[PDB]
Amino acid sequence: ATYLIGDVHGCYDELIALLHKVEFTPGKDTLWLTGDLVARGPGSLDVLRYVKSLGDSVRLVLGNHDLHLLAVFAGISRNKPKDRLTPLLEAPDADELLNWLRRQPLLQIDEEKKLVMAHAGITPQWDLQTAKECARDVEAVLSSDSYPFFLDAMYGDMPNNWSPELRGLGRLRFITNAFTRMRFCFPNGQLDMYSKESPEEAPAPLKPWFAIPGPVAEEYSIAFGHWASLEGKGTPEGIYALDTGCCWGGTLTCLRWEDKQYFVQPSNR
Numbered sequence: 001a002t003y004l005i006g007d008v009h010g011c012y013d014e015l016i017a018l019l020h021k022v023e024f025t026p027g028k029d030t031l032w033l034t035g036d037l038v039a040r041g042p043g044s045l046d047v048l049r050y051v052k053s054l055g056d057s058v059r060l061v062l063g064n065h066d067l068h069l070l071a072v073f074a075g076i077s078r079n080k081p082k083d084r085l086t087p088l089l090e091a092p093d094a095d096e097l098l099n100w101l102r103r104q105p106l107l108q109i110d111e112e113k114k115l116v117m118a119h120a121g122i123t124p125q126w127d128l129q130t131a132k133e134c135a136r137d138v139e140a141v142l143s144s145d146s147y148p149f150f151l152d153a154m155y156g157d158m159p160n161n162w163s164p165e166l167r168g169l170g171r172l173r174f175i176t177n178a179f180t181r182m183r184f185c186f187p188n189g190q191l192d193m194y195s196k197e198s199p200e201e202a203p204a205p206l207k208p209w210f211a212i213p214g215p216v217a218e219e220y221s222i223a224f225g226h227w228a229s230l231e232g233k234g235t236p237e238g239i240y241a242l243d244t245g246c247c248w249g250g251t252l253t254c255l256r257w258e259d260k261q262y263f264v265q266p267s268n269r
Protein backbone atom coordinates (compact mmCIF):
# COMPACT_ATOMS: atom_id res chain seq x y z
CA ALA A 1 0.00 0.00 0.00
CA THR A 2 0.98 3.67 -0.45
CA TYR A 3 0.83 6.08 2.50
CA LEU A 4 1.38 9.85 2.34
CA ILE A 5 2.05 11.82 5.54
CA GLY A 6 2.29 15.59 6.05
CA ASP A 7 4.84 17.69 7.96
CA VAL A 8 6.24 15.64 10.85
CA HIS A 9 8.26 18.47 12.50
CA GLY A 10 10.05 16.19 14.93
CA CYS A 11 6.84 14.58 16.21
CA TYR A 12 8.38 11.13 16.16
CA ASP A 13 5.93 9.55 18.64
CA GLU A 14 2.93 10.62 16.55
CA LEU A 15 4.56 9.44 13.33
CA ILE A 16 5.24 5.97 14.78
CA ALA A 17 1.75 5.72 16.30
CA LEU A 18 0.17 6.64 12.95
CA LEU A 19 2.25 4.12 10.97
CA HIS A 20 1.41 1.42 13.54
CA LYS A 21 -2.29 2.21 13.15
CA VAL A 22 -2.04 1.41 9.42
CA GLU A 23 0.46 -1.43 10.09
CA PHE A 24 3.04 0.11 7.78
CA THR A 25 5.34 -2.67 6.56
CA PRO A 26 8.49 -1.75 4.62
CA GLY A 27 8.82 -4.03 1.62
CA LYS A 28 5.07 -4.29 1.13
CA ASP A 29 4.22 -0.59 1.60
CA THR A 30 5.75 2.75 0.55
CA LEU A 31 5.69 5.98 2.55
CA TRP A 32 5.62 9.43 0.93
CA LEU A 33 6.61 12.35 3.18
CA THR A 34 5.89 15.99 2.29
CA GLY A 35 9.04 17.25 4.05
CA ASP A 36 9.70 19.43 7.09
CA LEU A 37 10.78 16.33 8.98
CA VAL A 38 12.58 18.36 11.63
CA ALA A 39 12.23 21.35 14.00
CA ARG A 40 9.67 22.52 16.61
CA GLY A 41 8.72 19.02 17.76
CA PRO A 42 11.01 17.21 20.22
CA GLY A 43 12.26 14.29 18.09
CA SER A 44 14.01 15.55 14.94
CA LEU A 45 16.96 13.18 15.53
CA ASP A 46 14.74 10.06 15.83
CA VAL A 47 12.65 11.06 12.80
CA LEU A 48 15.73 11.54 10.61
CA ARG A 49 17.25 8.23 11.74
CA TYR A 50 14.02 6.37 11.03
CA VAL A 51 13.21 7.93 7.64
CA LYS A 52 16.79 7.36 6.44
CA SER A 53 16.59 3.71 7.58
CA LEU A 54 13.56 3.19 5.29
CA GLY A 55 15.62 3.45 2.07
CA ASP A 56 13.57 2.58 -1.04
CA SER A 57 10.46 2.26 1.13
CA VAL A 58 10.27 6.08 1.53
CA ARG A 59 9.88 8.90 -1.03
CA LEU A 60 10.69 12.23 0.62
CA VAL A 61 10.73 15.80 -0.63
CA LEU A 62 12.66 18.51 1.20
CA GLY A 63 10.83 21.39 2.89
CA ASN A 64 11.92 24.83 4.11
CA HIS A 65 12.77 23.57 7.63
CA ASP A 66 14.93 20.73 6.28
CA LEU A 67 16.86 23.30 4.23
CA HIS A 68 17.19 25.59 7.26
CA LEU A 69 18.57 22.70 9.31
CA LEU A 70 21.13 22.14 6.54
CA ALA A 71 22.02 25.85 6.66
CA VAL A 72 22.55 25.63 10.44
CA PHE A 73 24.62 22.47 10.08
CA ALA A 74 26.91 24.13 7.53
CA GLY A 75 27.41 27.25 9.69
CA ILE A 76 25.42 29.38 7.20
CA SER A 77 22.58 30.28 9.60
CA ARG A 78 22.13 30.58 13.35
CA ASN A 79 20.36 27.94 15.43
CA LYS A 80 17.03 29.09 16.92
CA PRO A 81 16.42 27.50 20.36
CA LYS A 82 12.71 27.01 19.55
CA ASP A 83 13.57 24.60 16.71
CA ARG A 84 14.95 22.08 19.25
CA LEU A 85 17.64 20.94 16.81
CA THR A 86 20.56 20.66 19.27
CA PRO A 87 20.26 16.88 19.96
CA LEU A 88 20.36 16.20 16.20
CA LEU A 89 23.19 18.68 15.54
CA GLU A 90 25.32 17.22 18.37
CA ALA A 91 24.59 13.56 17.51
CA PRO A 92 27.53 11.26 16.62
CA ASP A 93 25.84 10.40 13.32
CA ALA A 94 24.86 14.00 12.52
CA ASP A 95 27.21 14.04 9.51
CA GLU A 96 25.75 10.80 8.10
CA LEU A 97 22.17 11.95 8.63
CA LEU A 98 22.56 15.42 7.12
CA ASN A 99 24.70 14.31 4.16
CA TRP A 100 21.90 11.87 3.41
CA LEU A 101 19.20 14.50 3.89
CA ARG A 102 20.76 16.99 1.48
CA ARG A 103 20.79 14.35 -1.28
CA GLN A 104 16.99 13.91 -1.19
CA PRO A 105 14.67 15.22 -3.91
CA LEU A 106 12.53 18.35 -3.99
CA LEU A 107 9.99 16.64 -6.27
CA GLN A 108 8.57 13.11 -6.48
CA ILE A 109 6.62 11.83 -9.51
CA ASP A 110 4.83 8.48 -9.92
CA GLU A 111 3.41 8.13 -13.44
CA GLU A 112 1.41 4.97 -12.73
CA LYS A 113 -0.35 6.70 -9.83
CA LYS A 114 -0.56 9.97 -11.75
CA LEU A 115 0.80 11.53 -8.56
CA VAL A 116 3.13 14.48 -7.95
CA MET A 117 4.53 15.59 -4.57
CA ALA A 118 6.51 18.66 -3.50
CA HIS A 119 6.69 20.43 -0.15
CA ALA A 120 4.58 23.52 -1.02
CA GLY A 121 3.03 22.29 -4.26
CA ILE A 122 3.59 23.09 -7.96
CA THR A 123 3.41 26.69 -9.07
CA PRO A 124 0.83 27.14 -11.86
CA GLN A 125 3.60 28.79 -13.94
CA TRP A 126 5.35 25.43 -14.35
CA ASP A 127 4.56 22.51 -16.59
CA LEU A 128 5.87 19.07 -15.66
CA GLN A 129 9.09 19.30 -17.71
CA THR A 130 10.02 22.67 -16.20
CA ALA A 131 9.33 21.48 -12.65
CA LYS A 132 11.48 18.41 -13.35
CA GLU A 133 14.37 20.50 -14.61
CA CYS A 134 14.20 22.97 -11.73
CA ALA A 135 14.13 20.15 -9.18
CA ARG A 136 17.15 18.56 -10.86
CA ASP A 137 19.10 21.84 -10.81
CA VAL A 138 18.51 22.56 -7.14
CA GLU A 139 19.11 18.94 -6.13
CA ALA A 140 22.40 19.05 -8.04
CA VAL A 141 23.64 21.98 -6.02
CA LEU A 142 22.35 20.50 -2.73
CA SER A 143 24.11 17.18 -3.31
CA SER A 144 27.40 18.82 -4.35
CA ASP A 145 30.48 19.45 -2.20
CA SER A 146 29.65 23.17 -2.46
CA TYR A 147 26.12 23.11 -1.00
CA PRO A 148 26.89 25.72 1.75
CA PHE A 149 27.26 28.42 -0.92
CA PHE A 150 23.84 27.55 -2.31
CA LEU A 151 22.27 27.45 1.15
CA ASP A 152 23.65 30.93 1.78
CA ALA A 153 22.34 32.14 -1.61
CA MET A 154 18.83 30.64 -1.28
CA TYR A 155 17.59 33.20 1.25
CA GLY A 156 15.55 35.99 -0.33
CA ASP A 157 12.04 36.75 -1.57
CA MET A 158 12.71 37.82 -5.19
CA PRO A 159 12.27 37.20 -8.06
CA ASN A 160 8.69 35.95 -7.66
CA ASN A 161 7.86 35.43 -11.35
CA TRP A 162 9.01 32.45 -13.36
CA SER A 163 10.67 32.88 -16.74
CA PRO A 164 12.85 30.38 -18.62
CA GLU A 165 15.26 33.29 -19.02
CA LEU A 166 15.99 33.45 -15.28
CA ARG A 167 19.65 32.73 -14.54
CA GLY A 168 21.95 32.33 -11.57
CA LEU A 169 21.02 33.33 -8.05
CA GLY A 170 17.54 34.59 -8.93
CA ARG A 171 16.62 31.41 -10.81
CA LEU A 172 17.77 29.19 -7.95
CA ARG A 173 16.01 31.37 -5.34
CA PHE A 174 12.74 31.28 -7.27
CA ILE A 175 12.95 27.50 -7.66
CA THR A 176 13.49 27.06 -3.92
CA ASN A 177 10.67 29.45 -2.99
CA ALA A 178 8.25 27.78 -5.40
CA PHE A 179 8.98 24.27 -4.07
CA THR A 180 9.32 25.01 -0.34
CA ARG A 181 7.66 28.33 0.60
CA MET A 182 4.75 28.95 -1.83
CA ARG A 183 1.22 29.54 -0.52
CA PHE A 184 -0.63 32.36 -2.30
CA CYS A 185 -0.39 33.50 -5.92
CA PHE A 186 -1.42 36.67 -7.75
CA PRO A 187 -3.89 36.19 -10.61
CA ASN A 188 -0.97 35.85 -13.05
CA GLY A 189 0.51 33.18 -10.85
CA GLN A 190 3.37 35.23 -9.41
CA LEU A 191 4.43 34.22 -5.89
CA ASP A 192 3.56 36.11 -2.72
CA MET A 193 6.13 35.51 0.04
CA TYR A 194 4.46 37.11 3.09
CA SER A 195 0.89 35.88 3.68
CA LYS A 196 0.59 32.67 5.73
CA GLU A 197 -3.14 32.77 6.62
CA SER A 198 -6.01 30.59 5.42
CA PRO A 199 -7.47 31.33 1.96
CA GLU A 200 -10.60 32.77 3.59
CA GLU A 201 -8.55 35.35 5.54
CA ALA A 202 -6.29 36.36 2.71
CA PRO A 203 -6.69 39.82 1.15
CA ALA A 204 -7.58 40.15 -2.52
CA PRO A 205 -6.45 39.49 -5.16
CA LEU A 206 -4.41 36.71 -3.52
CA LYS A 207 -5.61 33.15 -4.10
CA PRO A 208 -4.16 29.72 -3.25
CA TRP A 209 -1.69 28.50 -5.86
CA PHE A 210 -3.96 25.49 -6.44
CA ALA A 211 -6.92 27.80 -7.24
CA ILE A 212 -5.06 28.92 -10.40
CA PRO A 213 -5.29 26.38 -13.26
CA GLY A 214 -1.88 24.99 -14.13
CA PRO A 215 -0.61 22.38 -16.59
CA VAL A 216 0.57 19.96 -13.87
CA ALA A 217 -2.60 20.11 -11.77
CA GLU A 218 -4.70 19.56 -14.92
CA GLU A 219 -3.06 16.20 -15.60
CA TYR A 220 -1.74 14.96 -12.23
CA SER A 221 -2.85 14.76 -8.64
CA ILE A 222 -0.66 16.88 -6.35
CA ALA A 223 0.08 16.12 -2.70
CA PHE A 224 1.85 18.69 -0.53
CA GLY A 225 2.43 19.80 3.07
CA HIS A 226 3.84 23.13 4.38
CA TRP A 227 0.65 25.23 4.61
CA ALA A 228 -0.56 24.39 8.12
CA SER A 229 -3.08 27.27 8.38
CA LEU A 230 -4.93 25.61 5.49
CA GLU A 231 -5.66 22.77 7.94
CA GLY A 232 -5.92 20.31 5.04
CA LYS A 233 -9.24 21.88 3.98
CA GLY A 234 -10.68 23.75 1.02
CA THR A 235 -8.80 22.11 -1.83
CA PRO A 236 -10.21 21.14 -5.25
CA GLU A 237 -10.43 17.54 -6.41
CA GLY A 238 -7.00 16.08 -7.07
CA ILE A 239 -5.23 18.43 -4.63
CA TYR A 240 -4.21 16.92 -1.27
CA ALA A 241 -3.12 19.27 1.52
CA LEU A 242 -1.61 16.91 4.09
CA ASP A 243 -0.16 19.31 6.66
CA THR A 244 -2.63 19.48 9.55
CA GLY A 245 -0.29 21.07 12.10
CA CYS A 246 0.87 18.21 14.32
CA CYS A 247 3.78 20.14 15.82
CA TRP A 248 1.32 22.99 16.53
CA GLY A 249 -1.06 20.86 18.58
CA GLY A 250 -3.22 19.90 15.60
CA THR A 251 -2.91 16.44 14.04
CA LEU A 252 -0.64 14.28 11.92
CA THR A 253 -2.51 13.10 8.83
CA CYS A 254 -1.90 10.00 6.71
CA LEU A 255 -3.62 9.38 3.36
CA ARG A 256 -3.70 5.89 1.88
CA TRP A 257 -3.54 6.31 -1.90
CA GLU A 258 -5.31 3.12 -3.01
CA ASP A 259 -8.67 4.02 -1.42
CA LYS A 260 -8.05 7.71 -0.56
CA GLN A 261 -8.65 6.78 3.06
CA TYR A 262 -7.55 9.15 5.84
CA PHE A 263 -5.99 8.16 9.19
CA VAL A 264 -5.35 10.80 11.84
CA GLN A 265 -3.09 10.91 14.91
CA PRO A 266 -3.73 13.57 17.59
CA SER A 267 -0.88 15.78 18.69
CA ASN A 268 0.53 14.78 22.08
CA ARG A 269 1.08 18.48 22.94
Ligand SMILES: Nc1nc(=O)c2ncn([C@@H]3O[C@H](COP(=O)(O)OP(=O)(O)OP(=O)(O)OP(=O)(O)O)[C@@H](O)[C@H]3O)c2[nH]1
Pocket residue numbers: 036064065180181182196197198226227228229230231245248
Ligand atom coordinates in the same frame (compact mmCIF):
# COMPACT_ATOMS: atom_id res chain seq x y z
N1 LIG B 1 -3.97 31.44 11.05
C1 LIG B 1 -3.42 30.28 11.38
N2 LIG B 1 -4.20 29.15 11.56
C2 LIG B 1 -3.73 27.88 11.91
O1 LIG B 1 -4.45 26.94 12.05
C3 LIG B 1 -2.29 27.81 12.09
N3 LIG B 1 -1.39 26.79 12.43
C4 LIG B 1 -0.20 27.37 12.44
N4 LIG B 1 -0.26 28.70 12.13
C5 LIG B 1 0.89 29.60 12.03
O2 LIG B 1 1.34 29.53 10.68
C6 LIG B 1 2.69 29.99 10.69
C7 LIG B 1 3.44 29.27 9.54
O3 LIG B 1 3.83 27.96 9.97
P1 LIG B 1 3.49 26.77 9.05
O4 LIG B 1 2.14 27.00 8.39
O5 LIG B 1 3.51 25.50 9.88
O6 LIG B 1 4.61 26.56 7.88
P2 LIG B 1 6.21 26.22 8.09
O7 LIG B 1 6.76 25.66 6.81
O8 LIG B 1 6.37 25.22 9.23
O9 LIG B 1 6.89 27.67 8.43
P3 LIG B 1 6.74 29.10 7.63
O10 LIG B 1 7.84 30.03 8.08
O11 LIG B 1 5.41 29.73 7.90
O12 LIG B 1 6.85 28.84 6.03
P4 LIG B 1 7.47 29.78 4.85
O13 LIG B 1 8.24 30.90 5.58
O14 LIG B 1 8.43 28.98 4.00
O15 LIG B 1 6.35 30.33 4.01
C8 LIG B 1 3.30 29.59 12.04
O16 LIG B 1 4.03 30.70 12.58
C9 LIG B 1 2.09 29.21 12.92
O17 LIG B 1 2.05 29.97 14.13
C10 LIG B 1 -1.56 29.03 11.89
N5 LIG B 1 -2.08 30.22 11.55
Ligand SMILES: [Mn+2]
Pocket residue numbers: 007009036063065226227243
Ligand atom coordinates in the same frame (compact mmCIF):
# COMPACT_ATOMS: atom_id res chain seq x y z
MN1 LIG C 1 6.00 22.79 8.08
Ligand SMILES: [Mn+2]
Pocket residue numbers: 036063064065119180225226227
Ligand atom coordinates in the same frame (compact mmCIF):
# COMPACT_ATOMS: atom_id res chain seq x y z
MN1 LIG D 1 7.10 24.20 5.30
